[PDB]
Amino acid sequence: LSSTASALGKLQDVVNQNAQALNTLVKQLSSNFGAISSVLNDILARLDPPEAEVQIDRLITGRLQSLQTYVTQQLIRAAEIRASANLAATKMSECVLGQSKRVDFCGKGYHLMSFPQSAPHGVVFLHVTYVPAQEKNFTTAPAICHDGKAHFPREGVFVSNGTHWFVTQRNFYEPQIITTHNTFVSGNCDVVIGIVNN
Amino acid sequence: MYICGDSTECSNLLLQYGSFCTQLNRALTGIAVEQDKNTQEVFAQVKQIYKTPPIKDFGGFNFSQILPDPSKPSKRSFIEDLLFNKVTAARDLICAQKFNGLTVLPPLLTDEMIAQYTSALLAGTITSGWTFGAGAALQIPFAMQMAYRFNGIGVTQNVLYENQKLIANQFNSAIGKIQDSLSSTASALGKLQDVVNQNAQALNTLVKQLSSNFGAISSVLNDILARLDPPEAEVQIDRLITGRLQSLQTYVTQQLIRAAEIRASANLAATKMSECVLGQ
Amino acid sequence: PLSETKCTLKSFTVEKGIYQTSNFRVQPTESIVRFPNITNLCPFGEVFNA
Amino acid sequence: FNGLTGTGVLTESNKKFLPFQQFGRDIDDTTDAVRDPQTLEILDITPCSFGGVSVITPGTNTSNQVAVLYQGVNCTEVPNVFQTRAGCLIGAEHVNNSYECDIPIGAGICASYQSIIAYTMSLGAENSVAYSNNSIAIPINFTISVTTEILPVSMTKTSVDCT
Amino acid sequence: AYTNSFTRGVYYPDKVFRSSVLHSTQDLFLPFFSNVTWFHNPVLPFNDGVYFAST
Amino acid sequence: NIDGYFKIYSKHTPINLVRDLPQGFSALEPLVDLPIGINITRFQTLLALAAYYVGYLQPRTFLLKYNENGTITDAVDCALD
Ligand SMILES: *[C@@H]1O[C@H](CO)[C@@H](O[C@@H]2O[C@H](CO)[C@@H](O)[C@H](O)[C@H]2NC(C)=O)[C@H](O)[C@H]1NC(C)=O
Ligand SMILES: *[C@@H]1O[C@H](CO)[C@@H](O[C@@H]2O[C@H](CO)[C@@H](O)[C@H](O)[C@H]2NC(C)=O)[C@H](O)[C@H]1NC(C)=O
Ligand SMILES: *[C@@H]1O[C@H](CO)[C@@H](O[C@@H]2O[C@H](CO)[C@@H](O)[C@H](O)[C@H]2NC(C)=O)[C@H](O)[C@H]1NC(C)=O
Ligand SMILES: *[C@@H]1O[C@H](CO)[C@@H](O[C@@H]2O[C@H](CO)[C@@H](O)[C@H](O)[C@H]2NC(C)=O)[C@H](O)[C@H]1NC(C)=O
Ligand SMILES: *[C@@H]1O[C@H](CO)[C@@H](O[C@@H]2O[C@H](CO)[C@@H](O)[C@H](O)[C@H]2NC(C)=O)[C@H](O)[C@H]1NC(C)=O
Ligand SMILES: *[C@@H]1O[C@H](CO)[C@@H](O[C@@H]2O[C@H](CO)[C@@H](O)[C@H](O)[C@H]2NC(C)=O)[C@H](O)[C@H]1NC(C)=O
Ligand SMILES: *[C@@H]1O[C@H](CO)[C@@H](O[C@@H]2O[C@H](CO)[C@@H](O)[C@H](O)[C@H]2NC(C)=O)[C@H](O)[C@H]1NC(C)=O
Ligand SMILES: *[C@@H]1O[C@H](CO)[C@@H](O[C@@H]2O[C@H](CO)[C@@H](O)[C@H](O)[C@H]2NC(C)=O)[C@H](O)[C@H]1NC(C)=O
Ligand SMILES: *[C@@H]1O[C@H](CO)[C@@H](O[C@@H]2O[C@H](CO)[C@@H](O)[C@H](O)[C@H]2NC(C)=O)[C@H](O)[C@H]1NC(C)=O
Ligand SMILES: *[C@@H]1O[C@H](CO)[C@@H](O[C@@H]2O[C@H](CO)[C@@H](O)[C@H](O)[C@H]2NC(C)=O)[C@H](O)[C@H]1NC(C)=O
Ligand SMILES: *[C@@H]1O[C@H](CO)[C@@H](O)[C@H](O)[C@H]1NC(C)=O
Ligand SMILES: *[C@@H]1O[C@H](CO)[C@@H](O)[C@H](O)[C@H]1NC(C)=O
Ligand SMILES: *[C@@H]1O[C@H](CO)[C@@H](O)[C@H](O)[C@H]1NC(C)=O
Ligand SMILES: *[C@@H]1O[C@H](CO)[C@@H](O)[C@H](O)[C@H]1NC(C)=O
């Protein structure tokens, strides 16, 4: 965060858009929209009331047009930031105060706790996520049958290291001896495709 | 050019009207960049472009209806072709222009890139399951992915393996039924058809507006300049400039509103992809 | 073109990106007026030559 | 032509006007064809090539040289050159390699510094996971990673006195 | 006498050419399915424009 | 009549009916225009040796259909129903 440039590009974009809109609004104040001059004091010092009323009228209509354009665009942008703030509130409640099961809502990988940090006109989250690595691949079987009855794992998967068969949880390789304590039975092994003996 | 083309007199007369011609271009450019961001956000979620194995032992399941077709030049996945044919240009030679300064920019990602992205997502989902959406893509027999997805909703694994033969048939028949339903139903793709129709309608109303009079003596810049004297022309031309510019303001505001709702739709689509495609 | 980009941005430093600039037109090289054929000339002859 | 005044490039076309019709019209009500009143041959009108100009720059802090893109137009009629579905590129060298999109040109082309190269952007590194109806991959180790995402929640509260 | 004009009285309002396009206009016309006088002579009125046909 | 211009349109068609105007579509292509600049309020027919018809026009909006060759064969009388 310290080194990378434009790391906070979104907050910068918000500020830049707002400042640019204001700068345009003030700049439009210099344009005369066809009037004699773009300074009301100049018109009033130069022209009599009834004639000045024409120049003043044209200048007023131009400035009013520019101002209402500015406010309309500002409302559009405010709705966009309203949606962003709703998303930020939802992420705060779901990922800071809880643990989001919905995938990739808070950072890549399986989601552990998250931490909020303040920014000038926004919030910065730090999502702590669990990411696996060092993937070893094995052979698997949907079930194994023994004494003529098919066994399935209560939780985890069957894997063989080439010669011996083990039960392991899906997200982390912890082989265990297949027992009737971590498996459950359902019927005989003819309907199950790919069953193995053990 | 839209407000008044090839007219130096009107160009000058508009010059002293302010910096409007910058705000409109700025807003439209923002909208275009946002469209690029929308497509990237929805589709570009995979880091590595996976590809399906040549052999198709998916436990009896049959994804040929949704997997990319090798024989097709476009490599689109059969159903994708049905979608592209149903919906109503620079198609052959670059001609996306009109007589009045309106031009259409091409998207950053061509349809081939979108198709490759969706093919990568399909291959990842079929081979690796939901793992590729979290870390390294871990392959697993698809029958076993469906076993674990059954366990997710709350039915033991055995309910699948015993019914695997029947479940595969139900899956394949349902996919074929979707193909037929999309072919037959007329208003199926109305949501995309309506956005394309709305954009075309907006552009046409914008262009047809040029022929409007707005209270001037004529609707053509050169005509007015020809038939009247410089000052009377100026006062007449001014009326055309104001009307044209107001129409352009209305068009830009409508585009901003429509782009806001399309961005909401794209965010919802990205959430659906991330949650239901890359997970359960 | 870089100087023109600086002018349109109104900055002496430009960050990495793509920026737009005023458009161009293939200018017309000549005019072409194509009224129809001249026909049925007024009979000025008799008044000037009778 | 008669009173019809405009600017565009002309060409004889296949359209078949009726004997009484003088000029054609488009669906959007723009002039689209004209009949020559001398030889009565049917002409077709196309607007003179126009388009926006864009400047592709790597940033002054990097190098004071750039590449220019002429949107839409054909390089043959622009008063290193590389034609693209987005427009005509000049000053950028087209390379057959592919890379992460640095800045977007359009229609799948991107440009980046190296001397400004233009390339077809790469969607990502390809790999095929060794799928089989018999084998599964399990991770024997894990890494803890911290990701940061920034969201705006508000913006400056400005009030403008209309009067 | 009288007779009904079903779908006649349509005429090209201008010298323009349009292909495959559906156009709209405001102009003087004979309304569809309108009554038309059968004649074998007298001096008719002329409102602003009239329609004529003959066998 | 149009503010000084006198316009005449026409068409031909052979028919089988003998009672009155047949159905079907007929679009009148124009003949040359006359810039007379004089009013009209009456008219009458010259005859020789009986089977003719007369209608009166009315301001009205329409929808006209052009085909690929620029000919008109369809219409909607916009206040008929
Ligand atoms: C995952 O399984 C694949 C497929 O067996 C392994 O890659 C193979 O490794 C053997 C080594 O004897 C080679 O002969 C094959 O050519 C490889 N095939 C492919 C498609 O790569 C891979 O090694 C396994 N994963 C790990 C981490 O070793
Ligand atoms: C698969 O795992 C089994 C069980 O650990 C391995 O067999 C054992 O290996 C250890 C270490 O060599 C010995 O001390 C044991 O006596 C072996 N037998 C048993 C019953 O534990 C087997 O070698 C592994 N196979 C592969 C290919 O790694
Ligand atoms: C995985 O697929 C392979 C190949 O389709 C299966 O191997 C076949 O198994 C049948 C069982 O009756 C044998 O008759 C064939 O000779 C085998 N073919 C080969 C090439 O070995 C395998 O059984 C499948 N395994 C699972 C668990 O579905
Ligand atoms: C796994 O065990 C089954 C069940 O024993 C074997 O299938 C048959 O079992 C019967 C009764 O035990 C035997 O009479 C047969 O000889 C077995 N084989 C066949 C082909 O019928 C099966 O062979 C064993 N091995 C495997 C790989 O499944
Ligand atoms: C997967 O399904 C498709 C159709 O949904 C099968 O393709 C059909 O195969 C039959 C038999 O060869 C042909 O008569 C049809 O013409 C094919 N249809 C199409 C649209 O190509 C395909 O064979 C199935 N694959 C498997 C492995 O069952
Ligand atoms: C730019 O123009 C050239 C020709 O001026 C296009 O190339 C082809 O040129 C031949 C000979 O003039 C034509 O018969 C072909 O029709 C042209 N191609 C096409 C697709 O029409 C070239 O294609 C143009 N640039 C682009 C991007 O289309
Ligand atoms: C009126 O008569 C004069 C003189 O006879 C005509 O002018 C000559 O016309 C002939 C034939 O076109 C030319 O060769 C001569 O060069 C003309 N001479 C001059 C002095 O004009 C004229 O054309 C006749 N008609 C009118 C309307 O003036
Ligand atoms: C307008 O005048 C030109 C020139 O006299 C006519 O062009 C000639 O037309 C005839 C056919 O009628 C051709 O045989 C000649 O070769 C043409 N010559 C030239 C120089 O164009 C043209 O037809 C006239 N058109 C009208 C509507 O009057
Ligand atoms: C799991 O990954 C961690 C992180 O790479 C491994 O920890 C490293 O182990 C090596 C060798 O002992 C040390 O030199 C490093 O300093 C360790 N890194 C850290 C951050 O402590 C760990 O050994 C891996 N475990 C397995 C079983 O592969
Ligand atoms: C429109 O006009 C074209 C020609 O201008 C007509 O096309 C002809 O159609 C006939 C009958 O099918 C063919 O024998 C001819 O070869 C076609 N070409 C020409 C040049 O005659 C067409 O029939 C007309 N009508 C429509 C509705 O297109
Ligand atoms: C300019 O580039 C140098 C070298 O990468 C970098 O250290 C410096 O921060 C950059 N300055 C700006 C203003 O980007
Ligand atoms: C790119 O490939 C084309 C052939 O498709 C070849 O003509 C050209 O020289 C190559 N250029 C580079 C830089 O690889
Ligand atoms: C006009 O025609 C309609 C339809 O045949 C008929 O009902 C009506 O009496 C007619 N009226 C006149 C005045 O011709
Ligand atoms: C038509 O009659 C009006 C009076 O009703 C008259 O003012 C006008 O000049 C006449 N116009 C023509 C063309 O006869």
GROMACS .gro file of C-alpha atoms in nm, chain C residues 15-43:
model
   29
  493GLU     CA    1   0.003   1.005  -1.651
  494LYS     CA    2   0.000   0.675  -1.837
  495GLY     CA    3  -0.322   0.629  -2.032
  496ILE     CA    4  -0.516   0.703  -2.349
  497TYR     CA    5  -0.661   1.051  -2.395
  498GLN     CA    6  -0.897   1.198  -2.652
  499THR     CA    7  -0.832   1.497  -2.876
  500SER     CA    8  -1.035   1.713  -3.112
  501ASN     CA    9  -1.168   1.525  -3.413
  502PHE     CA   10  -1.087   1.572  -3.781
  503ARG     CA   11  -1.274   1.586  -4.111
  504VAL     CA   12  -1.167   1.507  -4.466
  505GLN     CA   13  -1.209   1.858  -4.600
  506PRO     CA   14  -1.409   1.910  -4.922
  507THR     CA   15  -1.176   1.986  -5.212
  508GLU     CA   16  -1.428   2.163  -5.438
  509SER     CA   17  -1.791   2.260  -5.487
  510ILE     CA   18  -2.030   2.100  -5.738
  511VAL     CA   19  -2.351   2.280  -5.841
  512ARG     CA   20  -2.575   2.069  -6.063
  513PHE     CA   21  -2.890   2.253  -6.167
  514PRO     CA   22  -3.080   2.096  -6.459
  515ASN     CA   23  -3.047   2.186  -6.825
  516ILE     CA   24  -3.124   2.535  -6.953
  517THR     CA   25  -3.444   2.534  -7.158
  518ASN     CA   26  -3.731   2.755  -7.278
  519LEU     CA   27  -3.536   3.079  -7.305
  520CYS     CA   28  -3.754   3.388  -7.283
  521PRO     CA   29  -3.854   3.530  -7.626
   0.00000   0.00000   0.00000
